[PDB]
């Protein structure tokens, strides 16, 4: 009680020798114990340097935009609530990540380990052998994408070597490296999907918006308090997702056994409002989008449909059904050659039947600015094109830009509606790229960029239907798209009638695509976006005019397509079949039709559905609706 | 979850039996007589000179029939559920369940009541039930990992929990061990323990027998080896955690230097109308050391507010209260080697503030003239290259125009 | 002498309400003073960032070889 500084006083020294001993011992303690405490402080300073059902997130550098895009999607499913997330990044945690990781919601779930997937100890710390899934994502901010891809290939090999029985989810940047990670359960190629989505925007407008709103798990509660009609119907219909259910055990479709696919797709939409886009037979693994009217349903088929709510989670519509209780659809069913392109630029390039020139075009004729023996034309005016042009302002022409041309030149596209393609590169294309595109009809390139008005005027921007901008472009992270946004903005002022399609790194920059600062309506949408952010909506950027019209999409949507694949293993295949990135025989393609005054006798969408599936056997997904909104 | 209900029940069950010990010590009178059970209850007294201490008051505790019945029921339920938890989750091991110090305490508090069933004479026997603290605190520690009901607060509550019991274990221990001598009441013992663990040590109530003195020594040693563990964990969480009025204006820049800041403060605050205003600085970089020294000056400490963030992030815009800001000054960086890149940043920053707070007068400083028409919407725009070269050209017609304009755009009273 | 943890014991509470007040007041001190200390630590942390006949050595970067 003396050395603890208590000092009760019931037993005390009573003579000066014993009193003196206490004094010198208190002094001894005050000069001996601090020496021990100081050494303990040194060792402590120098030393300073759960449950089951977890998934690992192996990245190179973790940023707040990527983390939240994962957490908002991974944890949007009730089945994935007990899961915790292990992050394996070899760099020190970003400060903005620490602030989120100290939030009580994410403190016990997100686990950040600093380490490499190539070290088995770090793999052991992450407990990858027990992990439910591994997400090997790629870094887009890196200046050397080939170096980045080589890292995620090794990381995919390291996890497969350490934990072979762990489903890998790899995000690959360049298509040429995709065949090294073909073993993975679910692979997403950024350049493949981005360019196919941009190309489809030039055929079916806002295909990027249509695909984006389908790969985001939302209940369709956005914009339900909005006074505008276009914000309530478009904010509700955004809750549609692609689900799957066996035919026999599906209350949506089981009553159509022995009936044609077109018969079931219409009546199910007529009755419950679900859109049956495709099926998958039990014999095969291939998924067919719109297999056709000649296809007869069977009790063992897996039916892929688009609906606001899952069949299991739609117990209310069946319960609501019990509260109440045009030709008809039949119950049963230079001249360009057509051929596959000769030189596939990379392994795994799905062979699509495309329109081709009868004779391989020489490398000299693929150039606009310079004239050659066959033609001395120097610009788009001298060529005298019969259709509107498509101008792609890329930096380098590789395998990704090849995936832009194939959808535009596919055999099911109209031959008379073939849009000439002008590649506005700032680097001279390599001969490997030209060997791939020398067979396609009306594909040209010219040196330049979107920041130079002279090159675009020579490209034919006056008579161009679209201008696709994909050019690449910092500590302040959201400033990455600063150059792209402003350069596109300049053309939005110079050419107000031009249709510009752009890709942005961060979806929060979609508001800046076509910025009208002196606009009451556009700035009013900012307040509506704040409410959705307050309501915990991941589709906050939804109500912006450019994104809704299809002018801009962020490739961050491909992040969500990979995380969704943990719960919907068909999502990647379904999206690629729409984009045409994989051509399964007997599977349909995404088309587009325009309703004119000659089709106004069809009053509603349901009546149009009946007309198509009874005559042309087409299944409509959605409507691109345009209004008059004088600014 | 049913498992959470089990843990919560167990925690409630541990705190229940701790209370029922208190109700026993509150309703037990040793002065009336103590004994084993029924047979010969005897009165005991303290003689200070007597070096021999009667252990009968310590060994025997008079326990009521109803109180003993409810105690053993809870104790049996305590053992049944601990055995259930042990048997439910082996985690691939059978051993190492007893070496961890949570099962030995459960034994010492639980088994004697099971034994008291066999011997009715042994029912009025004393058991360290007050130690059911450490199981209850441990049960709360296990539960705190499950749900919130706030990160450092959980450890602070645990430190309070181990402080609350370290008194509780002492008080019941010091009181019972004093049933042989001085017969301390529960409140007096509680006051004794509080002044003991706070190192005050009045000395008005002290142990007078060796068993009571030994417990205090042990209890002090326990505090010196249990509380520092809580403090060390508190230090870790605090270390990891380490990483006004109206009429304010925002100063959105890319990198703030001491030269630019003072040129603003000397001009913005040179007007008497702008004295109550405070300044919010929104720079995405860490504060320059020379800026920190100025911001620690008493004049500028309460006025200048430095927020590290981006104008393109709405949360940083929300922290700066830009919707209530009287003006936003989007200044450009001249030290940057890429002026067009810098201009593109202040164009986006002007768009970001105009999108977030449309009714806020923007004040943009543009470097290159070609980017001036993107920010024409701004209330007041200054082009650096336009003015600099026009002033130099005028110096070639009317000399020292750059001086004439300079002395006109500086707010001074002409006392120099 | 109570808040300084000295506790001589020459003048002590002798009734339970007076004893209870001291116990409460000690508990209050243990939960109020640390708040002041923590704020003092924060301010001290942020704050962390002769004779005649002297000569000045103005350099751009001082190395041990030059010094
Ligand atoms: K949904
Ligand atoms: K959706
Ligand atoms: K003046
Ligand atoms: K003391
Ligand atoms: K003392
Ligand atoms: K004392």
Swiss-Prot record, chain A:
Q: Which domain of life is it from?
A: Eukaryota
Residues on the Cytoplasmic side? 49-631
What terms describe the molecular function in GO for this protein? intracellular sodium-activated potassium channel activity; metal ion binding; outward rectifier potassium channel activity
Recorded catalytic activity of this chain's protein: K(+)(in) = K(+)(out)
Q: Does the keyword Cell inner membrane apply?
A: no
Q: How does it assemble?
A: Homotetramer; which constitutes the Na(+)-activated K(+) channel. Interacts with KCNT2; these heterodimer channels differ from the homomers in their unitary conductance, kinetic behavior, subcellular localization, and response to activation of protein kinase C. Interacts (via C-terminus) with FMR1; this interaction alters gating properties of KCNT1. Interacts with CRBN via its cytoplasmic C-terminus.
Name this polypeptide is given = Potassium channel subfamily T member 1
Which span of the entire protein is present here? Answer: 291 to 1029 of 1230
From Swiss-Prot, chain C:
Note the superkingdom of the native organism.
Eukaryota
Q: What name goes with this protein?
A: Potassium channel subfamily T member 1
Q: What family does this belong to? A: Belongs to the potassium channel family. Calcium-activated (TC 1.A.1.3) subfamily. KCa4.1/KCNT1 sub-subfamily.
Q: In which tissues is it expressed?
A: Highest expression in liver, brain and spinal cord. Lowest expression in skeletal muscle.
Transmembrane segments in this chain: where? 15-48
Q: How is it modified after translation?
A: Phosphorylated by protein kinase C. Phosphorylation of the C-terminal domain increases channel activity.
* Subunit composition and interactions: Homotetramer; which constitutes the Na(+)-activated K(+) channel. Interacts with KCNT2; these heterodimer channels differ from the homomers in their unitary conductance, kinetic behavior, subcellular localization, and response to activation of protein kinase C. Interacts (via C-terminus) with FMR1; this interaction alters gating properties of KCNT1. Interacts with CRBN via its cytoplasmic C-terminus.
Entry function: Sodium-activated K(+) channel. Acts as an important mediator of neuronal membrane excitability. Contributes to the delayed outward currents. Regulates neuronal bursting in sensory neurons. Contributes to synaptic development and plasticity.
What does UniProt say about this protein's domains?
A: The cytoplasmic gating ring domain of the closed KCNT1 channel harbors multiple K(+) and Zn(2+) sites, which stabilize the channel in the closed conformation. Under low-Na(+) conditions, the abundant cytoplasmic K(+) ions stabilize the gating ring domain in a closed conformation. KCNT1 contains at least two Na(+)-sensitive sites in the RCKs domain where Na(+) binding induces expansion and rotation of the gating ring that opens the inner gate.
Q: Which disease is it linked to?
A: Developmental and epileptic encephalopathy 14: A rare epileptic encephalopathy of infancy that combines pharmacoresistant seizures with developmental delay. This severe neurologic disorder is characterized by onset in the first 6 months of life of refractory focal seizures and arrest of psychomotor development. Ictal EEG shows discharges that arise randomly from various areas of both hemispheres and migrate from one brain region to another.
Task: Write out the topological domains of type Extracellular.
Answer: 13-14
Q: Result of mutating residue 25 to L?
A: Reduced the potency of the agonist C23 by 7-8 fold
Q: Give the subcellular location.
A: Cell membrane
Q: From the entire protein, which fragment is shown?
A: 291 to 367 of 1230
Specify which residues bind K(+) 1 according to the UniProt entry for this protein: 6-7
